[PDB]
Amino acid sequence: EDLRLHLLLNTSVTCNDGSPAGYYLKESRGSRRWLLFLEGGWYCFNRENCDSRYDTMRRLMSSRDWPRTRTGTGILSSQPEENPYWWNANMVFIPYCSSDVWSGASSKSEKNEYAFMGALIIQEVVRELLGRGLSGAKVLLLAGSSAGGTGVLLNVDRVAEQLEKLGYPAIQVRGLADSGWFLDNKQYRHAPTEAIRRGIRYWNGVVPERCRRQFQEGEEWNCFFGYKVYPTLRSPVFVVQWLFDEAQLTVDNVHVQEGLRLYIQNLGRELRHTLKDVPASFAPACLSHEIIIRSHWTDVQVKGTSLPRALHCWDRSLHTPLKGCPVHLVDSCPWPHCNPSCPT
Numbered sequence: 134e135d136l137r138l139h140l141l142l143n144t145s146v147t148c149n150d151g152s153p154a155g156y157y158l159k160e161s162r163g164s165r166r167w168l169l170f171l172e173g174g175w176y177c178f179n180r181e182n183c184d185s186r187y188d189t190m191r192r193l194m195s196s197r198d199w200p201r202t203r204t205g206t207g208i209l210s211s212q213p214e215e216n217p218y219w220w221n222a223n224m225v226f227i228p229y230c231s232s233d234v235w236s237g238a239s240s241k242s243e244k245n246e247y248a249f250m251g252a253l254i255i256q257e258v259v260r261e262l263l264g265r266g267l268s269g270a271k272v273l274l275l276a277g278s279s280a281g282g283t284g285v286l287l288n289v290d291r292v293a294e295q296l297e298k299l300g301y302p303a304i305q306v307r308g309l310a311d312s313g314w315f316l317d318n319k320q321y322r323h324a325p326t327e328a329i330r331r332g333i334r335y336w337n338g339v340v341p342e343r344c345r346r347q348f349q350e351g352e353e354w355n356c357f358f359g360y361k362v363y364p365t366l367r368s369p370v371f372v373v374q375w376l377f378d379e380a381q382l383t384v385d386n387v388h389v390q391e392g393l394r395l396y397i398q399n400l401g402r403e404l405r406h407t408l409k410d411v412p413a414s415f416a417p418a419c420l421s422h423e424i425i426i427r428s429h430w431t432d433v434q435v436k437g438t439s440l441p442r443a444l445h446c447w448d449r450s451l452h453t454p455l456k457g458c459p460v461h462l463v464d465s466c467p468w469p470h471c472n473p474s475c476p477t
C-alpha cells in the first residue's frame with residue numbers, strides 16, 4: 134500500500150461534491166521520471182444522471198471516503214518484475230472524482246449542484262508536485278486509462294504549457310493514452326456524441342486549443358475522439374487501444390451471424406486505420422476492457438513485442454527507427470483473439 138494520499142492544499146479545487154480533490158504519491162528520490170496517472174470511470178452529464186452516480190459510485194464524485202493509501206499496480210508498480218518499463222519512477226495516481234472526462238473547469242455554486250473541475254485538478258496536482266520534487270524532473274508522463282486515457286489527450290498539452298509558463302521549460306511532458314481512443318461510428322443496433330455534447334455544456338468542458346479552433350463553437354465534442362484530437366497535439370503521445378475495446382462495443386450495442394461478423398471486422402479495420410499515422414501505438418486484436426494498471430499488463434504482445442518493451446523503445450526514440458525496438462505495434466489480424474496473447 135505504497136502510494137500515500139495528499140488532499141489538495143487548494144481546497145477550492147474539488148471533486149463533484151465540493152470535497153477536496155487529491156493525489157496518491159510514492160516518491161523515488163533517485164529518479165527524474167514522474168508518472169501521473171489519470172483514473173477512469175465513465176462520466177455523468179446532467180443533474181439526474183449525476184445524482185444516480187452519487188448514490189452508488191460516490192468515490193468517483195467525492196474524496197470523503199478515500200483510503201489513506203493505494204497499492205501501485207501495473208505501470209504504477211515499483212517492482213521491476215511487474216513493471217519492466219518505469220519501476221523506479223516517481224508514481225502519482227490521480228483519482229477521478231470530477232465525472233467530466235477530465236475536461237471541466239466549473240465550481241459548485243448557487244446555480245451548480247456539482248463542481249466539474251477535472252482540468253483544474255490536473256493543473257493543481259502538477260503545481261503542488263513541483264514543490265515535492267517535480268521541479269527536478271526530466272520527463273513527466275501523463276498517463277491514464279478509459280476516461281483517463283481520453284483525459285490524457287485533452288490535457289497533455291495544457292500541462293506542457295503550464296510548466297513552460299511557470300518557468301520549467303526543461304521538463305519533457307509526454308502522454309500515454311490507454312483505452313481512450315474511440316470511434317464515433319454507427320451502432321450495430323439502436324449516444325456518446327449526444328451525451329458528451331450535453332456533458333460539455335453541463336461541465337463547462339474545455340478541449341485543447343488547436344482542436345477547439347478547428348471544430349469551433351458547439352462542435353468541441355469532436356475533440357473527445359482520439360483520431361480527431363491527436364493530430365492537433367504537440368506533446369509526444371503513445372496510444373494503447375484494443376482493436377475490439379469492450380466499451381466501444383457496449384456503446385455500439387454489441388454483446389455470430391454475417392451482419393455482426395462484418396460489423397466487428399469493419400470496426401477493427403476502422404480502428405487500425407485511425408492508428409496508421411500514430412507512430413507510437415500498441416493496438417492488439419483483442420476483445421477486452423483490461424487496462425495498463427493491471428498486474429499482468431506485461432503479458433500481451435503484438436508482433437512479439439510487449440507494451441513495456443514498446444514504451445521503452447518509445448523512450449529511446451525520444452532521446453530513424455531502432456533496430457529490434459519497435460514503437461508502432463498494431464495487429465492486422467481481423468477478429469478478437471486472433472492474437473494468441475490476448476488477455477483471457
Ligand SMILES: O=c1[nH]nc2ccc(Sc3ccc(Cl)cc3)nn12
Pocket residue numbers: 173174175176234279280283313315325329357358380381
Ligand atoms: O470507465 C470506463 N470504462 N470504459 C470506458 C469508456 C469510455 C469512458 S469515458 C469517454 C466516453 C466517451 C468518449 Cl468519446 C471518451 C471518453 N469511460 N470508460
